[PDB]
Design an enzyme around this catalytic site. Structure first.
Site, PDB file in Angstrom:
ATOM      1  N   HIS A   1       0.905  -1.220   0.051  1.00 51.19           N
ATOM      2  CA  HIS A   1       0.025  -0.033   0.215  1.00 51.19           C
ATOM      3  C   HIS A   1       0.882   1.188   0.008  1.00 51.19           C
ATOM      4  O   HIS A   1       0.221   2.304  -0.421  1.00 51.19           O
ATOM      5  CB  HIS A   1      -0.862   0.104   1.079  1.00 51.19           C
ATOM      6  CG  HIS A   1      -0.530   0.212   2.522  1.00 51.19           C
ATOM      7  ND1 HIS A   1      -0.668  -0.790   3.480  1.00 51.19           N
ATOM      8  CD2 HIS A   1      -0.163   1.348   2.871  1.00 51.19           C
ATOM      9  CE1 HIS A   1      -0.144  -0.137   4.497  1.00 51.19           C
ATOM     10  NE2 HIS A   1       0.071   1.041   4.341  1.00 51.19           N
TER      11      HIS A   1
ATOM     12  N   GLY B   1       2.259   6.212  10.162  1.00 50.03           N
ATOM     13  CA  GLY B   1       3.755   6.198  10.006  1.00 50.03           C
ATOM     14  C   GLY B   1       4.499   4.663  10.322  1.00 50.03           C
ATOM     15  O   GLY B   1       5.615   4.431  10.164  1.00 50.03           O
TER      16      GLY B   1
ATOM     17  N   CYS C   1       3.405   1.593   9.667  1.00 49.33           N
ATOM     18  CA  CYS C   1       3.158   0.557   8.788  1.00 49.33           C
ATOM     19  C   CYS C   1       4.670   0.171   8.099  1.00 49.33           C
ATOM     20  O   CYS C   1       5.564   1.099   8.007  1.00 49.33           O
ATOM     21  CB  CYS C   1       2.469   0.772   7.473  1.00 49.33           C
ATOM     22  SG  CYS C   1       0.908   1.256   8.006  1.00 49.33           S
TER      23      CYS C   1
END
Ligand SMILES: CC[C@H]1CN(c2cncc3ccccc23)C(=O)[C@@]12CN(S(=O)(=O)CC1(C#N)CC1)Cc1ccc(Cl)cc12
Ligand SMILES: CC[C@H]1CN(c2cncc3ccccc23)C(=O)[C@@]12CN(S(=O)(=O)CC1(C#N)CC1)Cc1ccc(Cl)cc12
Ligand SMILES: [Cl-]
Lengths: 306, 305
Positions: free
Chosen positions: A41, A143, A145
């Site tokens: 993503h 932030g 991920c």
């Protein structure tokens, strides 16, 4: 003596964290040998997340559209591919700090350490468990991920989780290091909700054995139970069914303390019925379920305080 | 979202742990530059521990009586000295992994991360607080002496604790890195006990702010209190007195939630007097006191190292 929620030393994983940037999105990546693993993503906008066509978004990208930063050094991307929900960026430099490692997919009830990271920089380490509903109760801000979960039994790091998403109830979802989500979750902003969660029974039993090893027995009783009657009662309190596998796994803790598994099950049945009556067990007023039988054996003394 | 007992990343400290052996005793040491720091009780036998004369025991030791092992490498000891309850072994090799560091002595109520070690090998990391009675509620077995506690600021490791002893109640005692004990303890096998402990009030308030930030608001109410009336309640429940310094320290949290400190004190007063009534706060049925105001701000902001 003592019993704490203990994480593995994070040094071996800290040496693998990098920052991955695609356009205006920055998240974390895991750099092992000449490959950087991160959530796919990273290539999406907010609008893309409703119905992302990852193959169509990825085909419009070149290697030089991905910026990878390791410390204050820029790594050069020389290849890219998608594997399930993870993007694999081939880089021109092998990580000299790559530890001995494996990718392992874990089952619900298993625990692991999370190294929370932001902008490729580690911020903290904590212990957690894969819940029966395949979510984790983590502590993650926007932030985070790409932050990973792992175990380090011996000098080998077993990577089991990569962070992707926060659900509406504030719990977290992610994948194994092959990009397969835990649970029925997708990397799409759909109506996704954590299913009803339950308590990890085998872990509560392990933690009761830890309390006995550390010198406490107030909660024991003179009764026993059959596995079936225990399960009929457990399910009424939203506890997971206890299987013969779980009974077998509790064997070494049962032998060190001299308390049969079904005898400890009778104690748990009674605690569920009575509560603690102002007492605590290992400094907790709730029945703790994020320590596995293996975690208890790892931390506790091999000698019971009789 | 989420709120966990979080430790600092331990990598910078892992690169400093070594094994120190003197006779039949083996414990952990901290290797910074060309010096290895460890508890001075490494030079004692079981009988010596009963009434040790550390200077007399140390004068009979040569450099080659100390075996220091870093990984699979034997370090050569070229000097030795004692500073309070810590032994400093000068070695022939500077640690190539020495991080930027300071030795800091912390106050009760402050938290730090512990890197539990055995035979010079790190086993786990956890968070804890220096209790008001100067003990720590750690998790340590025999062989853990020399394990250290620390905090990190940017790239600098502030070492604040070195493990020495377990008390009869299962709690732990140790020194700062200059060898001064926290608490009225001595490094001798003699009758020693943890004093009566109290709850760290400023930390409970910080954790109530953390619960508000995360969406738990059921305990909030329309009432306020004075600092004096709050302290009269707190003293009755074995809570530490709240000072104007603590109120000032909670300011950045009081502004980020819109809840005045004395307004949160009124919620804590009602929680003490009535209980939780079957409810939990951040998944706990007890009022948690091992998160400082700074720990709450850091975890709710994403500070990196
Ligand atoms: C694509 C960006 C990620 C970032 N993220 C987050 C990861 N960890 C911690 C975070 C804490 C705060 C906000 C974002 C967080 C996500 O959950 C995102 C963004 N969200 S969101 O903003 O709707 C999530 C949320 C809800 N409900 C507000 C919490 C949709 C979505 C859908 C599928 C997947 Cl795989 C990821 C994501
Ligand atoms: C000299 C060896 C250390 C090791 N140690 C321990 C450190 N951490 C965890 C441990 C868990 C298990 C046993 C030892 C532990 C200590 O407390 C020792 C040994 N003890 S003891 O065995 O009487 C302590 C005890 C009590 N009460 C049984 C727990 C005397 C003593 C007196 C002064 C100092 Cl500075 C240290 C020590
Ligand atoms: Cl598993």
């Amino acid at each position: 003596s003592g019993f704490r929620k203990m994480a593995f030393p994070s040094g071996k994983v800290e040496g693998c964290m990098v920052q991955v940037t695609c356009g205006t999105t920055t998240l974390n990546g895991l750099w092992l040998d000449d490959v950087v693993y991160c959530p796919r993503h990273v290539i999406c906008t907010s609008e893309d997340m409703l119905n992302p066509n990852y193959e169509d978004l990825l085909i419009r990208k070149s290697n030089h559209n991905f910026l990878v930063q390791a410390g204050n050094v820029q790594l050069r991307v020389i290849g890219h591919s998608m594997q399930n929900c993870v993007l694999k960026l081939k880089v021109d430099t092998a990580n000299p700090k790559t530890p001995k490692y494996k990718f392992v997919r874990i089952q619900p009830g298993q625990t692991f350490s999370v190294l929370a990271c932001y902008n490729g920089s580690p911020s903290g380490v904590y212990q957690c468990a894969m819940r029966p509903n395949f979510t984790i109760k983590g502590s993650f801000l926007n932030g985070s991920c790409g932050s990973v979960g792992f175990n380090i039994d011996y000098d080998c790091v077993s990577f089991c989780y990569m962070h992707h998403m926060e659900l509406p109830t504030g719990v977290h979802a992610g994948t194994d290091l092959e990009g397969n989500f835990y649970g029925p979750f997708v990397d799409r902003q759909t109506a996704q909700a954590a299913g009803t969660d339950t308590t990890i029974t085998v872990n509560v039993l392990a933690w009761l054995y830890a309390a006995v090893i550390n010198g406490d027995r107030w909660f024991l009783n003179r009764f026993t139970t059959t596995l079936n009657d225990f399960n009929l009662v457990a399910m009424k309190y939203n506890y997971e069914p206890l299987t013969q596998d779980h009974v077998d796994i509790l064997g070494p803790l049962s032998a060190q303390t001299g308390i049969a598994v079904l005898d400890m099950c009778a104690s748990l049945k009674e605690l569920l019925q009575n509560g603690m009556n102002g007492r605590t067990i290992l400094g907790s007023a709730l029945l703790e379920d994020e320590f596995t039988p293996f975690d208890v054996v790892r931390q506790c003394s091999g000698v019971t305080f009789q």
